[PDB]
Amino acid sequence: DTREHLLATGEQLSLQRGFTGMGLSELLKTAEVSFYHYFRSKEAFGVAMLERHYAAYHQRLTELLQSGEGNYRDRILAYYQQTLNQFSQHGTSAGYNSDNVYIMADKQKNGIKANFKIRHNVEDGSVQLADHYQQNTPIGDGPVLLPDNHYLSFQSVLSKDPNEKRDHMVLLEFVTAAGITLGSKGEELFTGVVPILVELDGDVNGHKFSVSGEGEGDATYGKLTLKLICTTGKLPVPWPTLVTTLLKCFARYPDHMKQHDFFKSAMPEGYVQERTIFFKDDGNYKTRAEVKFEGDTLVNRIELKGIGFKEDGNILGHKLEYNGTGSLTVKLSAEVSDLSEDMRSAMDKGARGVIALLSQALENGRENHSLTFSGEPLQQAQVLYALWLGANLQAKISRSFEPLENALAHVKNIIATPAV
């Protein structure tokens, strides 16, 4: 559909450029399409793009708050929870959901396999797809837990050390297993905070490079903190393309799922993690990593080979955004100022449809004893919206999980489970 394609394109463009900065020629270029054929003006296009965006988000909020997992309180917490991820985002869902990687047993190999799509943002507004095909196999001979089908929820943010001169990446991940409704000796090595060492030897199209990182992971909270330095000069590829290559052992497996943690069970001997990553319309990475304990440190030692890249493509030409975009509602909330009145009204109605959804959830949860809170639904809905808006925004400025963690902790406190 031509009209949908333009609106979809213009949303991504605004997600990155903003609306007032999105030019019409740049929109038809990236969309490969004219224009007044389908829209009266850029202003009318913007109203339509806004109404389309909020219609999809109201529907996403509706099925979460009225039909999601758990009770009304759990759904309200998830309304915050699904916004922590700032990596691999696109389209109507960008800034609204974590990235779920489906884990599956590979009994033939006594390990696990996965396949998933990573989406990088090209600075021109198009999206670089990266198809991951992954196999993991124990290094040791000891028995390993072979899991039933589940997934790992990945939430990541990339930042920079302001004192670091070298080409480098700061990477923070929150990773949680889920998908099963109702351990091992290796599990015991992860009860506390564990030093990490990462080493990558890379060769992409003949450009060699070495990446060396150090950090710590906290599996009880599914937390991973790394700072990775390119030790041979400029990284000849965009840092976002190495994120998945540069520790699923640090995932938080909830109590009822401990029998399905293959990654901790293979420890301390460890496991081999192999991938092919197919970059659409470009080349591919093949990676081989040993993840294992060396003394008290968890080591991820990696070799990487890339063949078939375009020297002027998105990867070798460094055309990839380093940061996530976040959501459009926050990106454009930021933009009211120069907007037309018809589009000022469009955000107003979009933000109010969200608040109304939060209010119904608070009211319904009261009535069915999912939750108690001091205040009334509509006013409390507005406080929750504002907190959600400020926290996401401040999570983007600081490139950190802290604001949403603190905000979510606040929400658990004020939207309480009723006394027994």
UniProtKB/Swiss-Prot annotation:
Changing V144A: In mut1.5; shifts fluorescence lifetime from 3.03 to 2.72 ns. Green fluorescent protein has been engineered to produce a vast number of variously colored mutants, fusion proteins, and biosensors. Further generation of mutants led to more stable proteins (at 37 degrees Celsius for example) with brighter fluorescence and longer fluorescence lifetimes. Keywords: Chromophore, Luminescence, Photoprotein. Changing D282E: In mut1.27; shifts fluorescence lifetime from 3.03 to 2.85 ns. Changing N149I: In mut2.1; shifts fluorescence lifetime from 3.03 to 2.50 ns. Changing F278S: In alphaGFP/cycle 3 GFP; improves folding at 37 degrees Celsius, reduces aggregation at high concentrations, and increases the diffusibility of the protein inside cells. Photocytes. One of its GO terms (biological process) is bioluminescence. Changing N100K: Increases fluorescence at warmer temperatures such as 37 degrees Celsius. In Esmerald; leads to brighter fluorescence. In VisGreen; leads to brighter fluorescence. The keyword Nucleotide-binding does not apply. Changing V101I: In Azurite; shifts the excitation and emission spectra to shorter wavelengths and increases quantum yields compared to BFP. Coiled coil: none annotated. Contains a chromophore consisting of modified amino acid residues. Maturation of the chromophore requires nothing other than molecular oxygen. Changing S153F: In H9; increases fluorescence at 395 nm excitation. Changing K258R: In Topaz; shifts the major emission and exitation peak up to 20 nm. Pfam families: GFP. Monomer. Belongs to the GFP family. Energy-transfer acceptor. Its role is to transduce the blue chemiluminescence of the protein aequorin into green fluorescent light by energy transfer. Fluoresces in vivo upon receiving energy from the Ca(2+)-activated photoprotein aequorin. This is Green fluorescent protein. It comes from Aequorea victoria. The lineage of its organism: Eukaryota, Metazoa, Cnidaria, Hydrozoa, Hydroidolina.
